[PDB]
Symmetry: C2
Subunit: 270 residues, 2 copies
């Protein structure tokens, strides 16, 4: 594969070079490239470059990935892919390549988020060897979670600005981008859960170091389900394909059942 | 996820049931379902079912998958996905869901083929513990390879029949299906390589048991590259987007360079 990318570069260079050599003004070149085949070549090259970066970003964040992470990712992917493709298909007619881009972005982040969860478990397990040191060591989760948190927030902030700016012109495309807000919001919400769980885990450490948690853990997980449910439910307000959004609303309802079970335990305890 | 699928079933059932309850003839039902929303529901359900089967097919063939397989798969996937999507995009206008289906089929097989290669290495390594027994044990590769071989051949056979049958009507769609023949042929060719390599590995075993291989190994790998190159080159004959096919033709040319290196060693040896 590495060389496939090298060759794509060489083609891409020529494509530009040729348009350049055969023109006088950079604007003439700009169009020739954005007009035909050469644009598609550039697009392919960009996607390959993005992909290579995401692989690096894993190396700089998670490194090698543990078997257990590889397994969870492998299992979650084909279904993640179907569902993304379903919501994506809706707008292919107007935006296919932009949509394909966002499709990839959502995947790469979902993968990073799934991995992060497993990294929390690892840092929790190491508590006994660190003992006192967890006080500072736990920040290793933060230097994974926070980094993703910044990215998720930035995407949402940017999506919204764009939507508002052209909301009256993008009469259908608002749904494209507003769905993206929902999906990226869902990631931000899951990350918030991991934050809160981390906080409760650090809280237990503290109390031991200082020297009912189970229900505190449920309260976090129950709230999280509620918050996510509220998001997907409010998403059904716009006219464009509420029935397609509904598949996730319905999943959240299943989660709401799981909340019901946790709630029963809470209510019973009093 | 498991329950997402259960719910999809329940919806899908109702969708049909309702059309059924509210009709007299099965044909009225057939249309209502194939006419609107209910068709899409059925399509979603089918894709989920196919996915679950592919997961089972792994369990019945490769089981759990070794870390090394998980790693190779993980790394090869995003690029496999880009390139499939590129060739797929070309026909989305007329066939998106059929195309998406074939996209998934090509992936699942590529994954099975990548895994198979690694299973050959494992069976080769075990030679020393089996000693004499390799005589029969090696058939374990065959009960992986042959099974995929049957499937690859059947797909090709079926694709061709369909193409010929409607070749004069599918004036553009021939390219869709003919590209699929090429891609599935490429899998059949890679599998042929593994067969031949297995045969040469068994051949070495035999000679030891009976009691220059490196160049024999190269001759197989060099032929394989040639055969694949010839396929992709002949694929540029049809009018429809020879430039898109060209990306693989060009990759094969890179391989042809690798053949050149192996050939030099052969020519030198004489």
């Amino acid at each position: 594969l590495a060389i496939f990318v090298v060759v794509t570069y060489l083609l891409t260079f020529y494509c530009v070079y040729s348009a350049t050599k055969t023109s006088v003004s950079f604007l003439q070149v700009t169009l020739k490239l954005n007009e035909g085949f050469n644009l598609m070549v550039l697009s392919i090259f960009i996607l390959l470059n993005s992909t290579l970066l995401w692989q690096l970003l894993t190396k700089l964040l998670f490194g090698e990935l543990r078997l257990i992470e590889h397994e969870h990712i492998f299992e979650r992917l084909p279904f993640t892919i179907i569902n993304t493709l379903f919501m994506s298909s809706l707008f292919h007619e107007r935006y296919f390549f932009t949509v394909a881009f966002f499709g990839l972005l959502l995947l790469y982040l979902k993968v990073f988020h799934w991995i992060l969860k497993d990294r929390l478990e690892a840092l929790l397990q190491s508590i006994n060897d660190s003992t006192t040191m967890k006080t500072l060591i736990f920040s290793r989760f933060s230097f994974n979670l926070v980094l993703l948190a910044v990215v998720d927030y930035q995407i949402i902030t940017r999506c919204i600005s764009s939507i508002y700016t052209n909301q009256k012109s993008d009469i259908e495309s608002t749904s494209l981008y507003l769905i993206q807000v929902m999906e990226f919001t869902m990631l931000l919400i899951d990350l918030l859960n991991l934050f809160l769980q981390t906080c409760l885990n650090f809280w237990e450490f503290y109390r031991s170091q200082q020297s009912g948690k189970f229900m505190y853990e449920k309260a976090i997980d129950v709230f999280t389900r509620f918050l996510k449910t509220a998001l997907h439910l409010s998403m059904l307000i716009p006219f464009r394909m509420p029935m397609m959004l509904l598949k996730d609303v319905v999943w959240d309802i299943l989660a709401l059942y799981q909340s019901g079970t946790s709630l029963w335990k809470i209510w019973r305890n009093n």
